[PDB]
Every structure is written in structure tokens, then in C-alpha cells.
Design a protein around this ligand. Sequence first.
Ligand SMILES: C[N+](C)(C)CCO
Ligand SMILES: C[N+](C)(C)CCO
Ligand SMILES: C[N+](C)(C)CCO
Ligand SMILES: C[N+](C)(C)CCO
Ligand SMILES: C[N+](C)(C)CCO
Ligand SMILES: C[N+](C)(C)CCO
Ligand SMILES: C[N+](C)(C)CCO
Ligand SMILES: C[N+](C)(C)CCO
Ligand SMILES: C[N+](C)(C)CCO
Ligand SMILES: C[N+](C)(C)CCO
Ligand SMILES: [Zn+2]
Ligand SMILES: [Zn+2]
Lengths: 318, 318
Amino acid sequence: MEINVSKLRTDLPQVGVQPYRQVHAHSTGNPHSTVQNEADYHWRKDPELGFFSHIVGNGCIMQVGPVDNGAWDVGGGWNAETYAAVELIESHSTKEEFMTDYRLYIELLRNLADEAGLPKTLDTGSLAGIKTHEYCTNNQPNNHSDHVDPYPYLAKWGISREQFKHDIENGLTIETGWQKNDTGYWYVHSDGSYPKDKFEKINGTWYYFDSSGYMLADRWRKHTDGNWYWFDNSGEMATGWKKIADKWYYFNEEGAMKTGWVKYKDTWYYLDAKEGAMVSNAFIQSADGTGWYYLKPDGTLADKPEFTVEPDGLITVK
Amino acid sequence: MEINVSKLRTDLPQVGVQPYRQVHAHSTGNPHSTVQNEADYHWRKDPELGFFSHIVGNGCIMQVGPVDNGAWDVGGGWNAETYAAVELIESHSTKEEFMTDYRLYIELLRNLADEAGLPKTLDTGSLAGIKTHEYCTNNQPNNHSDHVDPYPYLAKWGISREQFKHDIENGLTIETGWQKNDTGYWYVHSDGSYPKDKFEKINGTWYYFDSSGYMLADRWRKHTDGNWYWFDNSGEMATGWKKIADKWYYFNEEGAMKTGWVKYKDTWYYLDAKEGAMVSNAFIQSADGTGWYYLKPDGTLADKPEFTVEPDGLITVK
Ligand SMILES: C[N+](C)(C)CCO
Ligand SMILES: C[N+](C)(C)CCO
Ligand SMILES: C[N+](C)(C)CCO
Ligand SMILES: C[N+](C)(C)CCO
Ligand SMILES: C[N+](C)(C)CCO
Ligand SMILES: C[N+](C)(C)CCO
Ligand SMILES: C[N+](C)(C)CCO
Ligand SMILES: C[N+](C)(C)CCO
Ligand SMILES: C[N+](C)(C)CCO
Ligand SMILES: C[N+](C)(C)CCO
Ligand SMILES: [Zn+2]
Ligand SMILES: [Zn+2]
């Protein structure tokens, strides 16, 4: 992993003695500090106020103290078991920024446990392994701590204590971008979320995803704007003219199915106001209700319709 | 009451002695005999086989034996309490024929109880009053009878034992023909039934009655034949042209709302196939799909429509 050691303090005291049986998972408790803020403060601060080894934030890891040397990180006896103490910043604005750092945090904690010759377990009853500050607060001997990080901050962004344990113990893989199974496609954002019952523009193209997250393909959808949209076999939102089930429809540049008069090259077409399909061999009343326009069998507006009237008088138009 | 005494036997023996405390309600137990059949048989028969005083059937009452003389009618000790014994025939083909006779039966039983100085009660615990053969069978001393008339035959035509008792004790009024309350009209047939959810022709005129029996007035109804019918303020089924809520409809001679082309005097009108109303200022495609007929703003078919075409070319028709 890439580790920034520019603020790694080399003047910190050893706490306890080897072997160190624990890696400690923390969060800063600061809603505004960046990873650099934390490193700079840690750099100049009085170590007796507490110290640690790594800070994860803003897409990077800054090692601020030694490993395998104990630490004053959990306010109690298990300071003497600290192989490493990893802090996660709490200043994320979005779940995406959080997940980016959470991935590094999980990988770092797991790596440090392996390096220290410890089980990759979270908050178990054995002395060794990865322990949260909460677990230390609750279980360490000679405890002087009331901290319960990082569970509250993780829960904020949707990581339950059961998920944290699972990620620590299994590692974390988030398959992002287009995904597919036997049922259909879905699209996973950087943070693991995916669109459901909504439009999403992906790589310059609009798609719609159903309530389970499945991309709509070869399907109509009446949107919330009261408009009809159509999605072809690739899921792409229809624009322009489309022949759908042997009928012609027209969609504007924003995908909305149009009704009424639409110009096409040298001619005009009329799309049924009720069902949307191109109308043919029909009279359409003018907007001022003065008169009528005739649409030929091929759908094109009759520029110069000619009429013959039988005695009936049945009208034939041409 | 009108009583036919042409077959009144004067040779029957007295049974018991005055006073006679009971009027007995019977039914013949014969599914085919008419009132005359019963009277003729009673006339020639061996009295020891049983006898009575009145037979009600076919819209009349034939007195076949004396009153106030006892009778051999109930096969037991209360033969000696018989002031009168009234038999109802069981050969009715319809509920109407039954009700006609049932009315006479009720009135006769009540009248005979009054005449005999007895309470107009049915099957009570006191010695006196109107007693069914069933009640006698069940309660008389020295019983040799298993007859339970007239309850089964009454129940056949919809008179429960509770109704029989009520009619005997209160008398019976059936208000027939047109009836009305604050909600609407209903029409009561001779037998007390009235039409519900159906057409009924009354005095040469068709009406429709809802599921509670209320006549429909100023209302549409889609019938079971898939046709629409309309009923005006008097309930009469619409035929011919009707303007309903400012729109014109046409109904054929059987009341069915017509759609399509209808001839009227010197002209043709067209009634919308979907909602039925007269169409105006519109083109209607010919049946062979060859051409069109134009309907003027007033709804009349344009015999000689004349067209002018603007460059648009917007068509104006006249
Ligand atoms: C993530 N999937 C789209 C596979 C299913 C959601 O319900
Ligand atoms: C001919 N239409 C106008 C209907 C479709 C064009 O592609
Ligand atoms: C309705 N959307 C704007 C989401 C798509 C079309 O532009
Ligand atoms: C009627 N539309 C064509 C608009 C939607 C398909 O069902
Ligand atoms: C009645 N039609 C309209 C069908 C024919 C005109 O004469
Ligand atoms: C006899 N009524 C019509 C009054 C009511 C039936 O439900
Ligand atoms: C004029 N209509 C034909 C519509 C009605 C006749 O009474
Ligand atoms: C449908 N009915 C026959 C009952 C009435 C019209 O004639
Ligand atoms: C539509 N109709 C006129 C036929 C029935 C009224 O609701
Ligand atoms: C497009 N309209 C049919 C409205 C006008 C013809 O030029
Ligand atoms: Zn902590
Ligand atoms: Zn009897």
C-alpha cells in the first residue's frame, strides 16, 4: 500500500513490550479535520495527550507513528498491546469520500494484523487481533477510557457493526460500474450504491433502472414528469423517430415522447395525442378549429389534398 | 264472504257437544284435486274416513259440512272441539294461484274464529282458538293422527310457520300495484312479489327496477344484452330520439341505444360508436373504408360538402 511517512514521529516512547497482540481501529472524533490536519497536529502535539500510528483520510494513508512499539491510543492497559493504531477521519462530505477511505482503512487494518502475526478478527474474546477503541474501552484492564469509536461514525455512513466485522474478517471487494447477471444489468457507483426507479446518465447516455436496480431494455416507462420514455435493447433512452412494435413514435432530444404535429424534412407528421403513434389516412382538426388537415395513408401531411364527392355524397380524398 | 253451499252435506253426525272451542286449519294433501274435486269427493265419501266443513281453492270457498257440530277432521279427541275445519287445496301451479287462495283461507279462518266466539290465535296453549292439524296431532288427547298440515304446503310457497301465525293473528293485507315512498316507486304483483334488477312491462309500458325493487327514473342502465337503456322522469323506457344532459341519443323501438348511422326525415345523423351521442362537425369513414362522410355542425349529413384548400393546405368544409 502507498504510505506517506512525511509526518512520521520518531521521538515517541515505547509503551509496554513486544509482542504486541493488537491492532486498534479508531476514528478521529473530529468532524472537520483533514488527514493532513490530523498529521500536522499529531506531529506537534504533546504525546501524553495520546498518540497513534496511522491516519486514513482523503484517499491516503499517513503513518504518523511507529508500529510494533505500543502506543497511548486507547486510554488503558491495552495501550501496552498496540502494534498499530489506525485512525479514520470523520470529515467526509459524501458517502463516496467515506467509502474511498473506508476501503483503505479495512485493507490497512488487515495488512497490519498479518504483518504483526495476528488473527484478522474484529473484537473477539481472544487477546490478539483487531480491536476497536470501543472494545478496548469495554474490555481492557486498568481502563481510563470512555471512547466508543469507530462504530458511531461508521454507522453514520451505513456501515453497521456487523458489516465492519465482516469486512475486517473477509476483506472488502466492491465491484463497481456495469454489472450483469441472468436477470439484467445494474450500475454500481464508486460508493457501492446503484440507481433504482430513476434515470441515470452513464458515459454520456441516459438509462432507466427499475426498483431493484435492473436496467430497462426494450420497454416503455411513464416518468414522474407525466411523459412517456422508451428504452431500446441496449437500454439507451430513445430520441428522435423510433418504430416500436410496428408503429412510429417521435421522441424529443430529452427523450420525452411527443404528440401532435412534428416536422420531418420536407413534410409534417401527426402523432396521436392519446397513444402517441403516427396517424395516417385521417383528418385532424386545425388548432383554431377552423378547418382540417389531411394525413395520407403513408402518414405525410397532404399539402394539396384533392376531393371528389359522390352523390352520397361520399368523399374520396387524394 | 262468498260461500258456495251447493255441496254442503246435511247428513253428517254431530261429534262431541257444544261449545266447540277450535277452528282447524288443514290442507288436502292432494297435489292434483281442485276445489270442486274435493267437494264432490267429500259429498259422496264415507264420513268415517274423515270429514270437514270448508274447502278453499281456485278462488272460492265451498262449504261442504256444517259448523258448530264437531267433525272427524283431526283423527283424535279434538274432533270433539271442531267448530269448523278448513281445508286448503294443494294443487296450485303458481304462487299467484296459491296467494289468491291463501288470502281467502286466512280471512275465513279468522271470521270463523270470531263467529265461534274464539280468540284469533294460532296454535297457542289455550284450548280455544285456531289450531293446525299439526298442533292437534301433537297436543290433542286420545290422538290417532300423524298429519302435520298445513305447514309443509304453506312453506312450499314461501309462508313460514311464523308468517302463518302472524297472518292469522293480524289479518293479511297485500297492497298491490304501484307503491311509493320517500325513496321511489315499486310495483307489487298479485302474489306480493315485485321486480328487482329487471325490466317489467306494466300497463303497456316498460320500466326497469333496481335490486331493491325501486323504479329507475332519469337514469341510464347497461342491460345484460350489452345494450344501453335510458329511463325518463316517469321511469318510462326511452325510445326514439332523446336529448339527455344536452346531448342527442337515439333508441330503437325496443329501447336499445343505437350507434352508427340513423335516418331522420330527409337526413342522416351519426351517433358516436363509443358513447352514443350525436356527432357533429366531423368526418366519418365509410364502411368500405373508401372515403368519408361529413357531418355539419348541426349534425346533419352533408349531401354536397364543398371544400376549399389553403396553401397549408388547411381544409375548410361547407
Ligand atoms: C443488485 N441487484 C440488482 C442484483 C439486485 C437488487 O435487488
Ligand atoms: C418516416 N418517419 C418520419 C416516420 C421516420 C423516419 O425515420
Ligand atoms: C428526464 N431526464 C432529464 C432525466 C432525461 C432526459 O433528458
Ligand atoms: C401508449 N404508449 C405507447 C405511450 C405506452 C405503451 O404502453
Ligand atoms: C348513410 N350513409 C352515410 C352510410 C350513406 C349516405 O347516404
Ligand atoms: C319494498 N321496497 C321497495 C320498499 C324496499 C325493498 O328493499
Ligand atoms: C333533431 N334530432 C334528429 C336530433 C332530434 C329529433 O327530434
Ligand atoms: C329488453 N326488453 C325486451 C325487456 C325491453 C325492450 O323491448
Ligand atoms: C355512455 N352512455 C351515454 C351510453 C351511458 C351513460 O353513462
Ligand atoms: C403543421 N400544420 C399542420 C399545423 C400546419 C401546416 O403547415
Ligand atoms: Zn479511538
Ligand atoms: Zn288435516
